[PDB]
Design a protein around this ligand. Structure first.
Ligand SMILES: [Cl-]
Ligand SMILES: [Cl-]
Length: 162
């Protein structure tokens, strides 16, 4: 298992514009288009992202290319972030993937906001961190996915995804 296979399981794949769990226009493998309520504004963002007139539909290769970019940006955002970087550097490979997952889903600012949980991960207090991570809107809104990520931090294995 690796970060790409993990996120593909969590986000799924859709080739037509769709609404995410928060009601936002998205496409592909969890690629957020816009928070704006207008489907048209979403189509404009999409064509601009792809570089062609898509009419709201893309191909699998195009979905994977946006995904490759999105994973790369998540990793680079972690390494550039003064709060995230030290946590990432302290973690083993599996747990590094769980943090990438969270950043992909909620963005760098969002994750950096989990100040207490981050300190616990850095300290290698797995069980305590897992309990703290669950006291969040994140967990309450997407419990099945949050549980998978949290178990990954707790055990340092890919068991929740197998
Ligand atoms: Cl883009
Ligand atoms: Cl969920």
């Amino acid at each position: 298992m690796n970060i790409f296979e993990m996120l593909r399981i969590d986000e799924g794949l859709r080739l037509k514009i769709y609404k995410d769990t928060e009601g936002y226009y998205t496409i592909g493998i969890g690629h957020l288009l816009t928070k704006s309520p207008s489907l048209n504004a979403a189509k404009i963002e999409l064509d601009k992202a792809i570089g062609r007139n898509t009419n709201g539909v893309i191909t699998k290769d195009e979905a994977e290319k946006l995904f490759n970019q999105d994973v790369d940006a998540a990793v680079r955002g972690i390494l550039r972030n003064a709060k995230l970087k030290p946590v990432y550097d302290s973690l083993d490979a599996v747990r590094r993937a769980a943090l990438i997952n969270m950043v992909f889903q909620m963005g760098e600012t969002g994750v950096a906001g989990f100040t207490n949980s981050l300190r616990m991960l850095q300290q290698k207090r797995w069980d305590e961190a897992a309990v703290n991570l669950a006291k969040s809107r994140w967990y309450n809104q997407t419990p099945n996915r949050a549980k998978r990520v949290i178990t990954t931090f707790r055990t340092g294995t890919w068991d929740a995804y197998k």
